Ligand binder design. Structure first.
Ligand SMILES: [Zn+2]
Ligand SMILES: [Zn+2]
Lengths: 425, 152, 145, 48
């Protein structure tokens, strides 16, 4: 019953993931009708709102829990597959823990030691003859026992622990698991205060697809945006330096004259003034300042104002908007490139749609019957489930290469029609 | 059994003569696991497909394939063909078997999205011999996804 | 139907000016720039509404007292003490101000929550006034291209 | 403009040898022809 329940949660991960969102929209729609006299509720003459909030707050934590369980059942095995696979290939074909012994950098490499000693290291990768291969390939040049010491309704009573420390250290570094942990944490805090459910509206980004393609426009060049903001801060610093030296007296932001003076006489007040009402004014800094009607420093102040305008308000904001717009153009050009490549070339060979389109519908046969990605995947799916005794000559010629990573059996610059052009051949 | 296949001593009443198992004027459903046959018919289809694809322009053989179209139509979903560079420095077709619990897992769900993202990342980043390694790693990861999706 | 209703009132003939789109050709190629990515524009407006909701949540919890939009002092208080008033306030004078929300609010001259309010203001600016409006304009421009 | 410039240099150095100006079609006839022409035979560095 436990396994059927876990398979139910794993099979229904995305549905619950989408259900939490409608729950949060409902909660935050109810929260619009809040008030004070202390943070009471006053409805439009309907007292069925408090209990709906009280139950939905519980449902949200429960569904967050079930989504975490679905993630542990469904998607964690795939990242574990990848880690075990890369570790095994590093052992065989690179010799990591025998010869290289990696840096204190590459913390994955330092963490991925205590799986080596265990029994169920290849729990998921489906290659059990790993340790035998390393004993074969390094049994004599480095050691034999030196290798072996390096390597080797009643359900809840006997299980390993050396593996399930490495495993948890992996998953707690996994990004999406940490995100769902934050989700559960905020829903748990939602009962201490029923405003913390507002933060679960940020899951629309991960949920919807096209919204992620909106926000990719900003994420594509976030580094450049941040450094532009840094440039802005530096430029404003220079302007306030000039003002603090010379133009201190114009910055009386008091009321009408013969009043006490609220002034920017320091530097740390002038800087926050400039970064708070200088960029955020639409016009610059002269809008929020006493006018220079007949001063010796008039033209210098006019230069200060319009240069602030033409360097901060116009230019750098335009740089921001341009980085966004170039992001849109770049992503579109990428997708057009992939369409052109997969319409002009076979993925495998790299031949061209001119040798084939000689014949009618040549390329749409090459990429639908002969050289399909899928039929090259199902061959591996066949070989894996098959035994090494029932292999033919072709399957064995391929299986010797797969488990030693040559890839010459894939074609390249050649095909069946190029070989046997029907020319007494 | 009136509509699918016709009615002869050799087509319909053949099965009724085969189906004389019980005694209560009824019949079980173990006839179908008894009849098993597609394990042989698949290899026959592979054989005839091999001969046609390698030796065309033989009307003697096209006369034969016109007798067998009802079987080849059955086994086209289950029948693969790729092309590899063999040991003899020559290109070779490789015919093999495809299941149904793979075709019903590569087709509909999110793995199409995975394929799309894979092709995107490859054809943008790219490489010399860090291409087919990426394809094989994608195939392995996808295989584990399909196997786990069958475990339900 | 609108021309028939034009006799009940002779202002309903104004709606037949919208046939210039279907009539002219180049005007349809103007408006295709907007129609090409209307889905993306609408979802951007949705993102905007969500972000403003988070900002008014923060304000309703902490910064209630700055929102006295009365006249000079010693006057009755017109205030945004609820949530549904603060949300319409933010979506009505918060994006539609050119500067954000600090322009239309009492100034934090010597409060314990000063730097937090300054962060609230400039982050509103740099996320709503600049960014999302730029996304809108970029969707249009990419449509042309 | 700057982005299109960089894309142009990638296209040129993926479609042509810097020295000859031949094409990645005479060579890619053979497996990994162009990635031998521009790594063993006609390298800038071995000409330096
Ligand atoms: Zn091909
Ligand atoms: Zn060359």
């Amino acid at each position: 019953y436990q396994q059927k329940l876990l398979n139910y949660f794993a099979r229904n991960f995305y549905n619950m993931r989408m259900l939490a969102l409608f729950v949060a929209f409902a909660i935050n729609f109810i929260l619009l009708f809040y008030k004070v006299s202390v943070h009471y509720v006053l409805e439009e003459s309907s007292g069925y709102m408090e209990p709906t909030l009280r139950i939905l707050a519980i449902l949200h934590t429960i569904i967050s829990f079930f989504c975490i369980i679905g993630y542990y059942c469904l998607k964690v095995p795939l990242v574990i597959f990848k880690r075990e696979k890369e570790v095994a290939r590093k052992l065989e074909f690179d010799g990591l823990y025998i010869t290289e012994q990696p840096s204190e950098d590459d913390i994955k490499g330092q963490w991925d030691r205590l799986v080596i000693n265990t029994q169920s290291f290849p729990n998921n990768y489906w290659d059990k003859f790993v340790k035998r291969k390393v004993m074969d390939k390094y049994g004599e040049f480095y050691g034999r026992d030196r290798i072996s010491e390096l390597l080797g309704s009643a359900v809840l009573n006997s299980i390993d622990v050396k593996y399930q420390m490495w495993k948890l250290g992996v998953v707690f570094t996994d990004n999406s698991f940490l995100y769902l942990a934050w989700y559960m944490t905020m829903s748990v805090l939602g009962h201490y205060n029923n405003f913390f459910f507002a933060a679960h509206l940020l899951d629309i980004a991960m949920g919807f697809k096209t919204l992620r393609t909106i926000l990719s426009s900003v994420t594509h060049n976030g580094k450049q945006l941040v450094l532009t903001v840094g440039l802005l801060a530096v430029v404003v610093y220079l302007y306030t330096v000039v003002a603090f030296n010379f133009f201190r007296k114009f910055y009386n932001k008091s009321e009408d004259g013969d009043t006490p003076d609220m002034k920017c006489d320091d530097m740390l007040t002038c800087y926050m003034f400039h970064m708070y009402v200088g960029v955020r004014a639409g016009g610059g800094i002269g809008d929020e300042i006493e006018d220079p009607a007949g001063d010796e420093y008039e033209i210098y102040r006019i230069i200060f104002d319009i240069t602030f305008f033409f360097f901060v308000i116009v230019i750098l904001l335009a740089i921001i908007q341009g980085l966004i717009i170039d992001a849109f153009g770049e992503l579109r050009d990428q997708q057009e490139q992939v369409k052109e490549d997969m319409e002009t070339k076979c993925f495998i060979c790299g031949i061209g749609n001119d040798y084939f389109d000689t014949v009618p519908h040549g390329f749409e046969t090459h990429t639908l019957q002969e050289h399909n990605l899928a039929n090259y995947l199902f061959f591996l799916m066949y070989l894996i489930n098959k035994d090494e005794t029932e292999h033919t000559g072709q399957e064995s010629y391929v299986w010797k290469m797969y488990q030693e990573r040559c890839w010459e059996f894939f074609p390249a610059g050649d095909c069946f029609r190029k070989q046997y052009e029907d020319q007494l051949n | 059994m009136e509509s699918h296949k016709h009615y002869t001593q050799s087509e319909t009443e053949f099965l009724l003569s085969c189906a004389e198992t019980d005694e209560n004027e009824t019949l079980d459903y173990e006839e179908f696991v008894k009849r098993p046959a597609k394990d042989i018919g698949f290899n026959v289809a592979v054989l005839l497909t091999n001969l046609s694809e390698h030796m065309p322009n033989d009307t003697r053989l096209q006369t034969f394939l016109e007798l067998a179209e009802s079987v080849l139509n059955y086994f086209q979903p289950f029948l693969g063909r790729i092309e590899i560079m063999g040991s003899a420095k020559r290109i070779e077709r490789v015919y093999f078997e495809i299941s149904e619990s793979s075709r019903t897992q590569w087709e509909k769900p999110q793995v199409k999205e995975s394929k799309r993202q894979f092709i995107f990342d490859v054809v943008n980043e790219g490489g010399e011999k860090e291409k087919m390694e990426l394809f094989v790693n994608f195939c392995e990861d996808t295989i584990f996804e399909m196997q786990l999706a069958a475990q339900i």
